[PDB]
DNA sequence: AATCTTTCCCACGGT
DNA sequence: TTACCGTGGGAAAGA
């Protein structure tokens, strides 16, 4: 584990 | 006569106030040409920044020597460097930044390559200079057969910076391009962002802190996209070749530059990186028939990837205002090595000197990408040294003869021993 | 000839 | 409404 960030999850969908 | 060259005092004034002016250039690596009456948009618009606590010091300095808000105004215009082609005007009244989204190259250039050309000035007609950006490779138009390894400039690396498009149904104002506003990820139509693309192993974890590998990005390898700017990243993603409107499964080919793209969210059930409008979704794909090798996505779910590049340039006023352009603006890249220093950039003139600190060194100019300099003795910054009896760190600047500072982000250490 | 690259052509669905 | 316009697929031309 070298590199850093801020994880940021995106909302779901299907139709 | 010749204009007032810069004192160890007004060296001294700058090294402690550092009000330093910088021009940014963020562009893509790559241009499709125009033919005929076309117009082919360069995607993503190259954008232009006016970066640095200097604006705001040489506005303040023009008002204070009688200079209205118009007059004390930058002014920029860009365009196709070394060309016939005409120049268009950048909006930064208000900003410190602005989009070209209206610019593309002829067939007419017959060149292989280019750079982008930004001419700026204030609005009482002086003069700032040319900025040039990297070299941008012209394209007919992407090949429909496999990428070599052996073209690298049509390739993309693991931990370069690439921007994500995507187009509905052919339309220019349907462009949209990935990028984080207010710590979120959107669809923006007006701004991009340069997004580090990091290759993973295939057994590398999910988390905020995540171990990289190091060559090209091919089809079915794990990635992580993380903004250049903001540190924000999204989940571990599969980086899968569109064909039509599908993504392949089973496609592990060199990812090539304008090719269109597919991000499985890694481990999902076939969730995609989809947008829905200025909104940033992941959207289930739909299995194909008859064909278990490839998944139908959504419209916002392909993306066209472009390898991007900066062109950045840092300059100030050592002595004021100047009639001469600040450009060409040196850059240093590095420092190697009676002690010499050896300096390795771009844009050297023969009217540059090397300082150390407030100390000025004999320059030795070699050509525009080399210049040698002789280190100045320790005596020169510690009175009754004789020898370095502890470690003496110096910032290096370029000083044009005009009185122009160009800093650099390198120092130099006087080592004991 | 056969194949990939470059240039020419056109219409979808936008302003 | 008509007119005009990037864009991408595809045809034709070139190496």
């Known amino acids: 584990k070298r590199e850093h960030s801020t994880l940021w999850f995106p909302e779901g969908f299907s139709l | 006569s010749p204009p007032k060259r810069l004192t160890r005092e007004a060296m001294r004034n700058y090294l402690k106030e550092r009000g330093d002016q910088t021009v940014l250039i963020l562009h893509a690596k790559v241009a499709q040409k125009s033919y005929g009456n076309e117009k082919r948009f360069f995607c993503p618009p190259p954008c232009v920044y006016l970066m640095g606590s200097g604006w705001k010091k040489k506005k303040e300095q023009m008002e204070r020597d009688g200079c209205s808000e118009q007059e004390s105004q930058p002014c920029a215009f860009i365009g196709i460097g070394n060309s016939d082609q005409e120049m268009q005007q950048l909006n930064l009244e208000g900003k410190n930044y602005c989009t070209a989204k209206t610019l593309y190259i002829s067939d007419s250039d017959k060149r292989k390559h280019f750079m982008l050309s930004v001419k700026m000035f204030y609005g009482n007609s002086d003069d700032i200079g040319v900025f040039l950006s990297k070299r941008i490779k012209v394209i007919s138009k992407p090949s429909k057969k496999k990428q070599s390894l052996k073209n690298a400039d049509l390739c993309i690396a693991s931990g370069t910076k690439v921007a994500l498009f995507n187009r509905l149904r052919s339309q220019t104002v349907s462009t949209r391009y990935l990028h984080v506003e207010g710590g ?4 923006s139509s007006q701004q991009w962002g340069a997004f580090y693309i990091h290759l993973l192993d295939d057994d590398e974890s999910e988390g905020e802190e995540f171990t990289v590998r190091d060559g090209y990005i091919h089809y079915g390898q794990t990635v992580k996209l993380v903004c250049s700017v903001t540190g924000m990243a999204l989940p571990r993603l599969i980086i899968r070749k569109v064909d039509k409107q599908t993504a392949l499964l089973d496609a592990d080919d060199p990812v090539s530059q ?20 200025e909104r940033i979704i992941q959207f289930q794909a739909t299995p194909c ?13 392909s993306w066209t990837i472009i390898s991007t590049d900066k062109a950045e340039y840092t300059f100030y006023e050592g002595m004021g205002p100047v009639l001469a352009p600040v450009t060409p603006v040196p850059v240093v890249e590095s420092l190697q090595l009676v002690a010499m220093l050896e300096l390795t950039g771009q844009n050297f003139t023969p009217n540059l000197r090397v300082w150390f600190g407030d100390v000025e060194a004999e320059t030795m100019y070699r050509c525009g990408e080399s210049m040698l300099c002789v280190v100045p003795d320790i005596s020169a910054f510690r009175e009754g040294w004789r020898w370095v009896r502890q470690p003496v760190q110096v910032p290096v600047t370029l000083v044009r003869n005009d009185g122009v500072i160009y800093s650099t982000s390198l120092t130099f250490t006087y080592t004991p021993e």
């Open chain 2, 289 to 301: 028939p008859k064909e278990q090798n490839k998944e139908m996505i959504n419209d916002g779910a």
């Open chain 2, 184 to 187: 979120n990820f959107h669809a």
């Open chain 2, 258 to 277: 304008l090719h269109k793209c597919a991000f499985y969210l890694k481990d999902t059930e076939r969730m995609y990186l989809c947008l829905s409008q």
